[PDB]
Structure formats: structure tokens, C-alpha cells
Paper text:
This process leads to the formation of a spherical immature virion (IV). The 62-kDa [name] protein exists as trimers both in vivo and in vitro, and structures of the recombinantly expressed [name] trimer have been determined by X-ray crystallography. [name] adopts a double-jelly-roll structure composed of 8 antiparallel β-strands.
Image processing of [name] trimers revealed a small subpopulation of adjacent trimers bound together, forming doublets of trimers. Although the resolution of the resulting 3D reconstruction (3.9 Å on average) was not fully isotropic, it allowed unambiguous positioning of an atomic model for identification of the intertrimer interfaces. Another interface is located at the base of the trimers, which would be proximal to the viral membrane in the IV. At this interface, the major difference of doublet structure in comparison to the singlet trimer is the unambiguous absence of the N-terminal tail α-helix. The clearly resolved features in the reconstructed electron potential map between Y62 and R498 suggests cation-π interactions as the main stabilizer at this interface. Furthermore, the doublet is characterized by a slight twist of the trimer axes defined by a torsion angle of 8.0°, leading to an arched arrangement when the doublets are linearly expanded.
Numbering used by the authors:
A (entry chain D), B (entry chain F), C (entry chain E): 18 to 45, 49 to 547
D (entry chain B): 450 to 499
Write the structure that this text describes.
């Protein structure tokens, strides 16, 4: 019988851990580049990289806030290298995707109302944000098994390089705020920490490491090819919107609240102040193409086939209730189908307030989805719209927000709508895999316990670190050495504005590399 | 010293994983049975069964919604068989209990506002729900250690059989919905996927598997016995309500919001429309047994010992405020204690709406608990009641909902009230265990890290897969080969309607089987 | 090649677990002490201690609730000892910190609206709380690897001793509650349970155990020394507020709701009913020092540099709106900077209610931080304040709560403000560690996956149980055998009241002990 | 296993070219061997592999 009540406890190697902190050198196209140098004869290994960033005090007029997880969203590229070349690198989007299921790391990255609320400054000496520090946990392959997976420095010099994105990407601002001045005065101040182990008489053996490599297809192509595939552990596909032909303007953003219903509530709340207007006589200050109609005594307004129920309480006798009936409208020919945002409301009730001279809306019933809130403002006034398009007031136009969030997936902020209806992977000339439903994403989420998985073929099911991972292997003799991905996008109605958002296909392939310690640290591609 | 800075990496078995999808054969009281045939000599192993279901478009009038986790709630029975007989099978209730701590799984099964809101249709060709797909993760014993525990096929054919519940179980509807037509045109459309491993030169060894078996006691009996118990790893006990002598109709259901406070707010908001009435003179349209009392000027109405504070703002000059003082009442003798739902309110404030002719309630103080929310409507009008019992309007009665949720435990929807006061397990003639408080449920939740455990005796604490599980073993010489459970139910007040809900005792015993691979897969019960 | 599709199942030791419940002997400055004797020749080992407590019915008038996690907040000290002396013991604060990442355990220890809502009784016979039972999971070092790490009883008698905190610690009450009567008749009723193992032919070997050891520095000293350090696994530093120079009264507590926003909204809710008063003529019932100013028809009141926007709806024509402009004020010299709570508000909007003769508030704009919610009432009226101080009504003064919660950290209830600005740890005369930012807290939270970590130096990274833990070892020959800690407190403004809250420095040292089984259970100190 | 997949009517273009017809259908042709004088070539089942 095997003993389940006792173990012979082994004695480990004698070591001593230490928290180490280094400051960096900043250098300046004109992208920020920080270089850190780790040189110490007594540091045998390291892992658990942490980057700290000091955010400066922000003053002036306008509305200003930071994007969620700013610390992660700032990193464009990371590089650990030695005398023999690059040991490991990753793009910002692969790092964020790997850290998406670690909620404590996301909390330390910067997720609070003090940072992420859209604050207002009313005077040139107002303080919008107090100074604070954020901490980015750079999750690496070196963390899986604690001491077992640490990076061994075979007495060589290791240098770490962090490339930052430009500061316009991580800031959410409107047009009143003086961005060119904030951009002229902003500087990144980084610091790097890691755990070092001082080990007596270490005996190092070689190990394996995976380096992600991504390829971005051309605009609107339903294809993308990954070349030079010799040992891949997985393959993942998703789409990114490209907003370069726009001004990057969006109507609203909810800030710290991140539920889908929070996004929808923020959109409805921004429109309601322009939808129902209480005024003396026909309302003024809107473009002439707006057809605004007074509500009859029975309280029902019919817009073609749609019925809107409008009941406002405590309205003074010398005032009326008006309804904007074509707030946003899109069409391609003058008497065909119309996408009309005001037809998506069915009941609107509320109470007017005579103290503040505005209407406080109560319960709303609507069918608004995330896509309407995710349509960029410039698509409403494009040259292909045969109607005017935007009949909002100028005061409301001044509340629009520039958003250059770099890690948006799908065609909405939450990646909820699935626009890939069929996927086909080809290895050489033969069909490796095809699917009609998102069954490979269901499998990815079950296997990794994540809420935001992607379409992933996983080829490795072997326990980490203690075994050589299993791979799909090229057969150059038979021509199998490239992975072609081809999708068919879902069909949408040409009168919905989202048909004209441009899309890109992103393929990610994890290659397997061999780490060796013959005269310094070196890596070798496995073939 | 043991090295904690290096590992000799093992080369694993050479293999290739593959996603496979099958379509099934459908067969047809007249419950649907689907059977899928898996035949391929190169699929050596499988695990991670996922079942997909197509839900159709729903048209017509009435109120309609799906139960939460509809994909799981649809499965009545699953069987996996080969040429030698049944390998494994489970009831839908045991499957749901095994999957109740997997939040990712429950999310994929279909839990969202678009499926689970109670939607209203107004016109015969209105679309209530769009078509959508749900995914049911059939958790099996083969998933514990990934590749280690997978089901080995020894060149034999494998068959999977899924029996579905009738569609009345998964729909929450009112009386206006045309159920015989929906039930006549609804069909289940299933598809099965799994991960297959192609293994070169596989070396199979025998394993161990746990097969659940359930026994149902008679109505209202406090006993149950499992015969032929030779090697059990655990023993579970819980209660189910039996609504078969009723029409299964209830007053409210909260839908997507699933907190206890949400159940109470939904129930209170269903009652409030009938509780405080603003009328011109005594309100009409109510049964004669209603006791409607005008509220005095100081705002206090006394119902015997209870005081109700009623303050309503902006009431027009030609109107008064009335209070229904016996909305629901139940009693067994004409001068004993009375259960009265009107006495559970203490303060009622709100404001009147001139535009919509209704009250918008603002702040309520009450002591309503979950049991009032879980009392079926038909118990109020039972022949035991010496009072009329139900004094709601007919318009209120027409909005009631049919609910046939099959996996409800306890006597309330959340299994919160513990109605088992004492438990006694007998092995042969000796008292194995007995308890008063729910200390064994506390242990079950600590040991499995679940929020919804049951009273469970666990006999096995050895790490899974790598050891033969520990069991309680029969002593046939002494005659100890059956487990009889006896409970004592907690006493309730004879004037509470919940005392007359009928209960069933359910006992679940996990037996141990030996899997062997001498010419195909076979199981043998251990003696 | 290693087989990853099969394994040889080891037969474990033959055993039989059993749930065992014991009753205690209560004994009695006047702190309750419960002693339990475990003596039965057939129990070989135990773990998983659970303590149950019956809380009695509470009757009378006044406001009364329980602190969150009553069961854990009640325990002052735990000791397990045999005839040879103490085997293990821990203080209540270290136990709570060890179990703070276990949400299941916190849920069983008592966290619900039934217990934690602040209830009101109106007559001397009103029942405030129903009797209920709470469960305290006493997490031990014997739980890491289940059966592998369980405490073996080598035929000796084991005694468990629970020392209770006085009932004043776990109760939140106002002044109208009869505390001395409740305290005279309250009685702790404990019962202990554990899981025993009947083992045939057990084979016992010595193991390793860690005993936390606490040291508390003097009041307001920035230093603290830990003597007799020969093998420490970690070192922790934090601060506790000391309220001994006050009466322990606070303005608000949110009860069941535990978000930081909930703390703030409860504080604002208590202030707003006194901030804006609707009255016919100058409001009465305030101290002579109050400067109450009428709000002009324009709606803007200017208070020095601050501008307050006040808009109240539905105010009757014969009444006016007044604003309390110095509700709480603190200063140390007569014409310098002033901390004024009225200037922390910028916009106040709401609607008047003619039924309840009070204001229902709508949108509020404020800058209240958790420190304002965490200032004791005694500090506003201290002898160093050169102003009167508290111009609130006596009706508002009667709703303050006594709170003696024993495990508060930081200087606010949520441990959000970081008041330690620099930390230096000395080992002998050499600096072992120094830091400016909270990098050691970031590492503690990443490594333990908690949200309430402390500043911790960790020295052990080897897998538990199977390896002997790694320690920092004393060199008494060179004199390095003590751990000194020195902090510098962050500078605060001399006109903020929090500058005068007294602080204590807490150091926690985890000492390593060896457990041996040569004739009974014994421990030795590692040197 | 996927034997064949196509997005455009390339198998119908091939059918029409190979049989000189104006009204072909989507056809996988497995036999290209002269008629009658040879045993035609076929795609053959492998019941062992399903």
C-alpha cells in the first residue's frame, strides 16, 4: 500500500530571493523607447516583470479621462535580449489577451472611478486628476512553475527594452481640451522590478519557450497567410476595425461602468435630452432637414409603422411637447429602406422640472443594441448618405469624444456580435479544419476558463514545463509549411451603417523555440 | 539536495488532437431520442462532450420566456453505450448539480437578457425571439485529468443517446400563448462535438469510474432505501416539491435578475398594483370578500395589531386613497391564527401620475421573505380555506405565469430554507451517522468550493485519478448491504400555506465500477 | 516516451473518515474561555476545524446590527495543546487575514441582510433578530495537502481552547439600546467539529509547521523590533488605528452594502438631510455658532472660493431654502487654512415632498473621500479645535453608532489610503530591504490572489509540504539575529483632522517549528 | 474527413469541358479511363475507417 499519511520531505537547493528595482534611460518615429540594463554577478535568475508608470497632474478646461487598463494599453512592444540577439518579444495585443482573465492584474493596471471617470474642468487652474502610479504585470512564459521556469542568466548581460504607444491612444478627450499642449509636455517615467534568486552551485539544463508571431491581412481581405510554420502550438483568428478613414469620433462612453446595459444606458441618456424638447413654440437651433412633430392629446405618435407612447408630467400650460422623429437616419436611395434611430423607441415617460428648466426622464423601453452605440459619428455624414444625416444641435455636437482605443475587437466594444460565419484553415493544399458555428471558441473558453476567448485551434494538451509540448509539424516534402486562413463574413443590410466599417483579419501563430545555454543564452527555432 | 531550478523534459506520446462534429438520427409520452454513432479505428480516445441545440423563431401573441440555463434544463437522460452494454449514464438533475459551480459553462448554456426576458407580443406576426444556439457542456468523469482520464475506444463502436424533456418544461408562458400549436411545431435539432486524439502505439491500462444512481421515495414519506450497495463513494440527500396535484401556476418570476432581492422586488411590484388603489369612491370590479378601507388623514391604518403608514403625494382634490386590508388570507379554523399578506407591509409612499393614471412607488419597508414568493397560486383557493382566499382582480389573475422548472429543490426557488431538522444513515443495523445542524452541508461547500452544496457524506479524500478511491464497503456476512436514510421534517405552523406542499425525499448513491479493455470496453460492478 | 494516456492506480491506506461533533465546557478579565478534550483511541488524525455559535434572540428598542463576519470577528485567540505544551496557536487578526481570500468561508461566517441590516424596534417587545447559527472555519496549517498534512494524534489527548472577545466588539448599536442588559444576559454557546480518520497501521514521520508571531510597537513610534529570529519565512508590516482616547462614535456605517461608493452614499445620505433645510423662517434647533444663509432666487450661493449650486423642486410658495455653510469645520489657528465640509459640495438638486415634509434628493456632485466617512465624531469637538465645531441638530446627534471593530487597518475602513511612504528593514546592522513604492504589496497580491494584501517580504517559493520550506537563517556569531523595522509616515496637512489619529505599527514574523512524534506530540524551535 | 470544397462553380466548368455539354451539373468525376476496354477507376470505401 502507498502511504497517503506521510512524505519524505526533500531539501531544496539553497537560495535567497530579493526584490530588485532599476530605473531606465529614455530615448526618442519619435516613439518612446526605454532601455534597462540588468548587470549583477549575483543574480542567477529572474522572473515576474513589473513596469511602473507615473501619470502627471492634468490641468485646464474640458472633459478628460483615461481608458481602462491604461497600463496595459500603453505597451506596444517588449523585448528581452542578450549578446546573441532577441530572446523574447510580444506585441501589446498579445500581452493584453494573455492577461485578460487575471482580474487582480487588471485591477492593479488602473481601474477605478478616480482614473476612469470622465472628469470636467471649469477653469484654467482646475486640477482634473491627481498624480498617481500604475503597475503593469508583464506576464511572461517565465511565470508558470515559479522557480522551475525562471530565466537563467548564464553569467551574461540581459537588457530589457519597452516600446511605448503614443499618448494620443490612451486618452479619451473632447475637442475643448488642449491636447497639443498636453502632448507637448507629457513624458513617460518608467521603472522595472523583478525577483532575483541567488543560487549556490546551480545546475542548468535546457528548456523550451513559445514566442507568439502575428500577421495582419490587408484591408477587407477574407484571407491571410502565415509563412514558415515548422512547429506551431496554436492558431487564433479575430478581426480589428480600422478607423483611419474617420476622425475617430464617437457619441458617448460610459467610463467606469462596463456592462453592456451600461453602454446602452449611456447612449440613451445622451440622446434623451435632444429627443423630447419642451419649448414655447416650434423649437429652434436644429438644422432645417429635421421633421419635429408635436404630440397629440391622446399621447400616441405614429411614425410610419412604429408607435411611440409619450407622456410627460407637470408640463406648464404655456408650453408644448415636441418629438424629433429623424434624429439619425441613413439611406442609399430616396424611397427605399431607412435606418432610423428614433423608430427604436416605443414608450417614453418622465417628469419635467421647472427649477432647472429641463426634463428628467424616468422609465424607457427600447431595443437599442451595442452596434448603434458603436457607430462612429463620421459614418452618419458620409458622401454615400442621400439624406442630411445628423440633425442634432451644436451644443450636443460639442460633447462628442475622440476615442483611439487600440485593442478593440469585432465591430463593437465588447466583441459581442460574431461577424465570422465560417472559418477554413488550410495546411498546404488540404483542408485541416472547417466549422460553421463557434464551436472552437466554446472549446477554447472551456479549456482555459476565460470569458473572452477567440477562435483557437489548440494542438497542445500536455502538462506544462515537465514535458516537451506536442506540436503540429511541417512536412516540407509534401508542401505543408504555410497556414492559410479564409473566412466568409456575415452578410449585413446595405442600409445599415455598420456595413461600411472596414475590417482586418488577424492571425496569431505560436511558434516553439529551443533555449540553450552553451556560451551565454541563445534561442533556436525548431525545424 | 533536490534540484528546483531544472527539469529533465520528458517526450510525450506522439499524438494529434482533432475537433469532430456529428449529426444525429432522431426518433420518437413520445419523447424524442437521438442516437449518434462514432465509428473510426483511428480515434483512440475522446472527452469534452458538447451538445448544441437550435432554438427556432417564435411568433404570435402572449408572454413568453425561457428558463435560465435552458440547454441544461432540456436534458432528461444521457446514455453512452457500446456492443457490451451501458458504459455510463446520468440523469439531468445529477448533471446540472455537477455543473452548477462552472460559471463559464452556465454562461454558454444560455443566460442573457435576450433569451430570459419575459417578452410581450401584441400582433399575430410579431417576432418574440430571434433564432439562436445554446451549448450544453456534458461534464463527465473523463475530464478530470485531461488526457489521463479520457475514454479509450478499443476499436469498438460507441453510441451516445440523449433523451429530451417535453417542451412544456423549458417554457415560461401565460394563458394567452398558444401552447398546443407551439408544441405541435417545435422539434429538437441536436448536434454533438468532442475532441478526438489520434494516438500512435497507445498503451491502455484499466481505470475506475463512478456511476450515479438515484432513488425516489414515496410522496410524503420520511424514508428511502438504496439496495445493492457494495462500494459507495458518497451519499446525497435533498428534497423536491411535487406540484402534480396543482396547476403549477405562480404569481411572478424575476427573469434574468436572479438575486433574492430581485425575486422579492418582482413579487412586491406584482402585489403593489393591487394593494394601494386610488379611486373615486369605493373601487369596483373586485370580489365581495374584499375588505377595502379608506386611509385616515394622519396616514395610519391599523389592521388589528399592525400599523400601515400610507402617504401619497399630489392626489387630486376629488379623489381618496384606499387600502386593501386582506389581499390574500389563509386559515384552518374560524378563530385561530390567520396568515394574512396585508399585515406584512409597514410603510407605503409614492407619487401619483396625472399623465398615466398610475402610481410610481418610491420607498417601501416590508418583511416579505422568499417563501411568500414561492407559494403556488392554487393553494390559496384550496378547499381547506374557510375564507374565500384570493381577492385579486381578474385583470391581475390573467397575468399569471405557468412554471414547470424541473430542477427546483427544497420548498422555494433558491433552496435557501433548510427543512431537514435531523438525518440518520444506517449501514446494516448500525447507526453510521446523525446530525442536527447542517454541518455536513458546510463541510461539502468547504471541500468542493461551491455555493450550492447539499447534505453529502463523502467517504473519499484521496487525490483523484492517481489513486483508487476510498469507499464504504459491504459486510455481506453481517448482512450490511443496504443504506436506509430517515429524516425528520421541521415543524411549521399549521396556518402557514407552505405546510401543505407535498415533498419527496431523493437519495443519490455513487457506486464504483471497474472498466476493462479485454476485447472492447466493458464495465463490471465491484463486489 | 512517457505515457500520457494511462497511469497505474496506487492502492491507498485503508481508512474511514467520520464527522465528529463535541460539546464544550465554558469557563471564565471576565473573558469567555471554552475548553474541549478530544480522547478516543480510534481517531488517528484530524483536520478541518469548524466552530459553531448560537446567537440568541435580541429584543427591545433602538438600532442594532451585527458587524460583517461576526464569527471571525469574535475570536481573540485559538490554542491547540497536548500534555507536552502548546502545539499551535494564532491570534484572531492573523486568522482573519489568512481566511480573507476565501469567499465561501466569509459567506458562512455570517454575511446577509438579515444579520447586517440596521434594524429598528419600536416597542419594548419588538423582536429585532431571529435566532440563527454561524460557522467559523478555523483554517490551520494542517489543511494544505488534505490527508498528507493532517495532525496525527499519537494516542495523546488534544485540547482546543477558544478565547472570545467581549460582545461589545461585534455589536453596532446607538445610545438608545440597553447595552448593559443585553451584555448581562448574553452568553456564548460554542460547539466544535472536525473530520477524523480511522487508519489501520498508520506510518508517521515528522513534518514542518509555521507559527505566526506578533509584536506591537508603542503608540506613535515609527519603530518595532522582533527578537529571537532564527528561521523566518516572511515579514509583514501594517498599521492599526487606536481609538482609546475617544468614545468610538462614528457618523455612519453602510451595513450589508460594502462598496466604497456605498460608504460614501450612506455618509452623504446622513449629511444631506441636515445640509438643505426647508423651513418657514430661519431654522431653529441649531447651536448659536451656525451660519445659515438663504439661497438667492438665482440659485447660486458663493462660499468664499467655493460655489454651491442649489436647485430644489416643488418647494411651496410660503417657504424658502437654506444652506448650512459650515456643518463641520476644523482649524488650528484663527486665520489660516480651514477644513470645511460644506465646501466639498458643488451641486445639490432634488424635489420637495409635501406628504413627508422632507426633501428627496436627486443628483449630487461631490468630492467626498473615505477619510471624511472615517473621522470619529470626537475629533471634531476636541480641545485643540479653535471653533465650536459641530452645528448639527441633536436629533442627528442621536443616530451616531458605537463601533469597536477590532480588525481595522489603515486609517479608513477600506485600507485604501496608503499612509506609509517609506519602509526600511534592518537585519543586524545591514539594510536588508528598502522601498519607496508599494512593490512588495503588489507582489503579495499577485502571488496570493487577494484584494487585501499587506506589505510582505516573502522568502519561501518552494512547493509546500513536499519540500522543506526555505528560510533566512540567523548568524548569531556575527550578531545578525533580530529584525528591526523603521517607517516614515507620509506628511499630512496640519489642518486635516486625520493628522491627530494615533497609529500603531504591527510586525508579523512567521517562525518555523519542527513537529516530532517521539512519545506524544512535541514541537522544537529551529536554531 | 472533408473530401472536397469549393466556392465557385469550378467543378461544373470542369464537367462541361470534359463532357462537351451545355447543361452540366456540379459533378465530381472520379473516372478518366477510356470506356469499355478498361475496368473503370473508382473511389473505394474503407469501412475500417468508417
Amino acid at each position: 500500500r502507498s502511504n497517503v499519511f506521510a512524505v519524505d520531505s526533500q531539501i531544496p537547493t539553497l537560495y535567497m530571493p530579493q526584490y530588485i528595482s532599476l530605473s531606465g534611460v529614455m530615448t526618442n518615429d519619435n516613439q518612446a523607447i526605454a532601455s534597462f540594463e540588468i548587470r549583477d554577478q549575483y543574480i542567477t535568475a529572474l522572473n515576474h516583470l513589473v513596469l511602473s508608470l507615473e501619470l502627471p497632474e492634468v490641468k485646464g478646461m474640458g472633459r478628460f479621462g483615461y481608458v481602462p487598463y491604461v497600463g496595459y494599453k500603453c505597451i506596444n512592444h517588449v523585448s528581452i535580449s542578450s549578446c546573441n540577439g532577441v530572446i523574447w518579444e510580444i506585441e501589446g495585443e498579445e500581452l493584453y489577451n494573455n492577461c485578460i482573465n487575471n482580474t487582480i492584474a487588471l485591477k492593479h493596471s488602473g481601474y477605478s472611478s478616480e482614473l476612469n471617470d470622465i472628469s470636467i474642468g471649469l477653469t484654467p487652474n482646475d486640477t482634473i486628476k491627481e498624480p498617481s502610479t500604475v503597475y503593469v504585470y508583464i506576464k511572461t512564459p517565465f511565470d508558470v512553475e515559479d522557480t522551475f521556469s525562471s530565466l537563467k542568466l548564464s553569467d551574461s548581460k540581459i537588457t530589457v527594452t519597452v516600446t511605448f504607444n503614443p499618448v494620443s491612444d490612451i486618452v479619451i478627450r473632447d475637442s475643448s481640451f488642449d491636447f497639443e499642449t498636453f502632448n507637448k509636455e507629457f513624458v513617460y517615467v518608467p521603472e522595472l522590478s523583478f525577483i532575483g534568486y541567488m543560487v549556490k552551485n546551480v545546475q542548468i539544463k535546457p528548456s523550451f519557450i513559445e514566442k507568439p508571431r502575428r500577421v495582419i491581412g490587408q484591408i477587407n481581405q477574407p484571407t491571410a497567410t502565415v509563412t514558415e510554420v515548422h512547429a506551431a502550438t496554436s492558431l487564433s483568428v479575430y478581426t480589428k476595425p480600422y478607423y483611419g478613414n474617420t476622425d475617430n469620433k464617437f457619441i458617448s462612453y460610459p467610463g467606469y461602468s462596463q456592462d453592456e446595459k451600461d453602454y446602452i444606458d449611456a447612449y440613451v441618456s445622451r440622446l434623451l435630452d435632444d429627443l423630447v424638447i419642451v419649448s414655447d413654440g416650434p423649437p429652434t437651433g436644429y438644422p432645417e432637414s429635421a421633421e419635429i412633430v408635436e404630440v397629440p392629446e391622446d399621447g400616441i405618435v405614429s411614425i410610419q409603422d412604429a408607435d411611440v407612447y409619450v407622456k410627460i408630467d407637470n408640463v406648464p400650460d404655456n408650453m408644448s411637447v415636441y418629438l424629433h422623429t429623424n434624429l439619425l437616419m441613413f439611406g442609399t436611395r430616396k424611397n427605399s429602406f431607412i435606418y432610423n434611430i428614433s423608430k427604436k423607441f416605443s414608450a417614453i415617460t418622465g417628469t419635467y422640472s421647472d427649477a432647472t428648466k429641463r426634463t428628467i426622464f424616468a422609465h424607457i423601453s427600447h431595443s437599442i443594441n451595442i452596434i448603434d452605440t458603436s457607430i462612429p459619428v463620421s459614418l452618419w455624414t458620409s458622401q454615400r448618405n442621400v439624406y442630411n444625416g445628423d440633425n442634432r444641435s451644436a451644443e450636443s455636437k460639442a460633447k462628442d469624444l475622440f476615442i483611439n482605443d487600440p485593442f478593440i475587437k469585432g465591430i463593437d466594444f465588447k466583441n459581442k456580435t460574431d461577424i465570422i460565419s465560417r472559418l477554413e484553415v488550410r495546411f498546404g493544399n488540404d483542408v485541416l479544419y472547417s466549422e460553421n458555428g463557434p464551436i472552437s471558441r466554446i472549446y477554447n473558453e472551456l479549456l482555459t476558463k476565460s470569458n473572452n476567448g477567440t477562435r483557437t485551434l489548440t494542438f497542445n494538451f500536455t502538462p506544462k514545463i515537465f514535458f516537451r509540448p506536442t506540436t503540429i509539424t511541417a512536412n516540407v516534402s509534401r508542401g505543408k509549411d504555410k497556414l492559410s486562413v479564409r473566412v466568409v463574413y456575415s452578410t449585413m443590410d446595405v442600409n445599415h451603417p455598420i456595413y461600411y466599417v472596414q475590417k482586418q483579419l488577424v492571425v496569431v501563430c505560436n511558434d516553439l523555440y529551443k533555449v540553450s545555454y552553451d556560451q551565454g543564452v541563445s534561442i533556436t527555432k525548431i525545424m
